[PDB]
């Protein structure tokens, strides 16, 4: 029904990055939501969706950007919320810029981190179905099963 | 009284940085057990500490280590709780190489990851700390109790005095 | 005798590579203000102060910030004015944490961002008062009269002795 | 009528980078003049240039270069005006070998840099333009008009 | 007949790098297994394999892995057998997350880490060829003949 | 009580890192000989110390350099024998370059590549121990004991006291 | 008619790079030859043309190599003369392993160091005139027409 | 005794690096003059230098620099002779950005690039003895004699006492 997780993005054309995110929510059947929320040319809009995140029933709060990357930091610095952050590959770069303004945050106010690009994205989504796990047992059986499924699928040899 | 949330570190010279978030833990009443595991020297206590962490009752783990920093990484792939990873500063590479070795997870085995050293230690047990909370009412209350003093207790100017 | 220039940092730590800024101003009578505005502990306050500066009289803003350091990058998103960020040495990884949250603004907001440090915190300054410059000329000419100082003051042999 | 903002750069290679920042003062009605003047094989076009600057009438100069990007700091070296610089991305190190030698001025003779590569381009022709803002006020609402729009535009949710 | 080098990585994508170990232990007739074993999928899978190495007849384990690289060091924890380490070049950093993950070992478990690549694949079985070759007197005469054609077949001028 | 492994470096300034090297094989009781060999200042030294190695009797080389470090890989150039190279240190920066001018040797001649610094010389040594212990049953049991002594002797919590 | 410049590279994959250096030299009408010479493959190759050089009547010795780039370090310990070092675009860390395995070098025995890739070729061979300009006035001349020739050639603006 | 090699730097602080080059050049007997020039602060003293160096009979110019350091680039724009830069060490960024901001020159404008710090200084000194012996015999021998001594006095094993 109402969505728990909020994933957000700086652009559309973090969205390459973001929907393994999504995806993954969606095949855990975790409700949640997918927008564009940018620190630099939204502020207001970041303000007022991370302001009131909890009290709309959100949980966690995936937020990614690429470059000199503010949107998980400051999405944290307005909500009591757990925010995961993930670093989008920027073009020059390679999300070196990316991870360094998402990880290093001061001591304070959190943010959760996740791999440079796809990987990242996608292991948010299953850090984030590891938090809601903890008081959801049906979710938390959905859960066990997808990693029991990713360990026992791995081949024993490599195909040439 | 029992613990909910586990920090672990590869040795004792990780205890400078780790006492911070066993400090922040204490500090918002919550319950947690603080060990040595290292990845390399004890590779089957390791095993043994991740699959065991959820039936031991365990919600959160914290796992600090610097250099080739394989704790966090390895103890996320033996249990299903979520796995928060502090970078240790290490001596020759100022902790890049710790950072770099726990946060560039293959998808599939997420460790959230804190700043290097000791503001990501406090911050491990802060993220942690809000994790908990989303389902325990009155470590809620502590926190955004907590959050809402931090903002409060900012100066508004320097002490610019020679 | 109101404030033209604004000077902002997120923690009394910033205070001895900002001071550097402070001074210059003061030197070329710059009339300025200097405050503490943290992105992460007070955002409501940032907001505020970055919407109300042009209105307030001002006319530029030097902000800085190390670490994650998001504090110019916010204060540009919520002013017209220009920002001019300075990256402060931070302790592991020597400001290019601090260097890289600041300059590598996406399209669409700036941040003018100095060198790393007290040289940075200096040339905020002296690049304010270069725009300031352009229509006060009694500021002008203090700042012709600076630059020229500065290049008839270089020696022109090192002291070599023992 | 006669320019205002001077946008040079070291060589017809840094065009693609450059010709964002001369596109968005066109679109704000800011007359410039848009040069190549190389540091390393024209120095005595640079010295002309930026010693000139002012008296021509130009208020603010944006420099671009890649490698050892020398450019905007001699030009700064030269005059009085404020010089915005842009790292343009380099072939073998991405832009790290132009943004370091452009951002890291010692005091006493400023650059005010921004990102490496075309967002570098489009962000110092907009500082430039909030400069000029300052003492000019049609252009101040057009510029206000400008990041009113850009705020507007951002959609609420990616497409796929 | 038994394998004496065991070849291990973590996944299908790090063939294209380690194919180039199986092929040079081929070349010099070394009898070995080729497997895909997984630090962060498989953890039960890599204990066994390390703990079980030297009963097994391994002489030396060549481990290839990319990222937040593990599988080497895991498999040194568990085994007294020399462990030769390739860091697979990953898409954002290059590399470089998978050479530091690899080669800074604390003291008391090594890896004698390789090139980022192919060349360290190449070489890390070249490097386990030449530890056999120690105790090996017809693989000696081999690797002999390997490394005199290698230097003999160099030109001496370029082709255009 | 011949040497079975050489280690060499560039200059006593290494000697500190070295060392490490050597008090692990002298524990192990594997007889070596250490020396210098600087590959730019001694170029023929090295030529004839690389390519005369295994007539001599030596079954594996420990070479550490610092900076533009080539002693080891231009070592491999000349021996057939394995050589295992250690990262020294540099004072601006902090082993990176050595690192990187060790490790990333082309395909064709290999140097097994241990951590910058005196957990590398360690890390050589026994890596060396390793490397024989294929072939010397005795030493195989003290590489043993001494694994095993180093896992049983990790403890199981931090001191944790103020 | 004899060489006075010798280029020397690590393997037929460099010349993409250090033909650069080949077309400079000839352009200027400076005689040379240009070998590969394998530090890690060909050492004792290496260990007779450095020692050898002066006596052949080279003045100096231009070298590329890359990755763990050994090569005109290793050439300057055997030799005399000024050897000039070209870190070849590496596939990983795109020539900074390149760069500060040449640059580097300990107080006693220089490399003078070139950009990463072609401009650093070109830029050697540049150098080697400017060397041996300083005693061959038809050079020197022929030099001088060549760096006029760059500065009058830079265009005054960019082409759309 | 008139100068043949200029060593120039842009400010007193570099002259901590800078002095390794004037020793070696003075221990060759290599007669050379020593100035402060400051490519940011006194730009048309480094054109006038630069342009007039070979008609005053300089051959070789040795240049360090710091930071973003432009002043070998800058000497090279403006003379034919060959220059040879010297990174010195930064403070925050341990030279790396005064090694990229000298070595980097795109095509058609030299600078021969030597070590970050003292290293580097005293090796541009050797380059620029090596450059001015392919036309000077009694310095051929000299510098002959010089690099001979270096490597006979390498020592054969390390200080190993405790």
Request: proline content about 7%; aromatic content about 4%.
């Amino acid at each position: 029904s109402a969505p728990v997780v909020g994933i957000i993005m700086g652009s559309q054309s973090d969205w390459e990055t973001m929907r393994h995110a999504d995806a993954l929510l969606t095949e855990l059947e975790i409700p949640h939501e997918t927008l564009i929320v940018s620190a630099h040319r939204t502020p207001d809009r970041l303000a007022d969706y991370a302001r009131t995140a909890a009290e709309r029933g959100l949980n966690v709060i995936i937020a990614g950007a690429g470059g000199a990357a503010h949107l998980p930091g400051m999405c944290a610095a307005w909500t009591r919320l757990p925010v995961l952050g993930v670093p989008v590959e920027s073009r020059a770069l390679k999300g070196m810029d990316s991870l360094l303004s998402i990880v290093q945050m001061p001591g304070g106010v959190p943010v959760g981190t996740l791999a440079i690009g796809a990987s990242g994205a996608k292991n948010a989504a299953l850090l984030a179905a590891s938090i809601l796990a903890l008081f959801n047992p049906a979710l938390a059986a959905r859960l066990e099963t997808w990693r029991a499924l990713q360990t026992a699928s791995v081949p024993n040899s490599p195909i040439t």
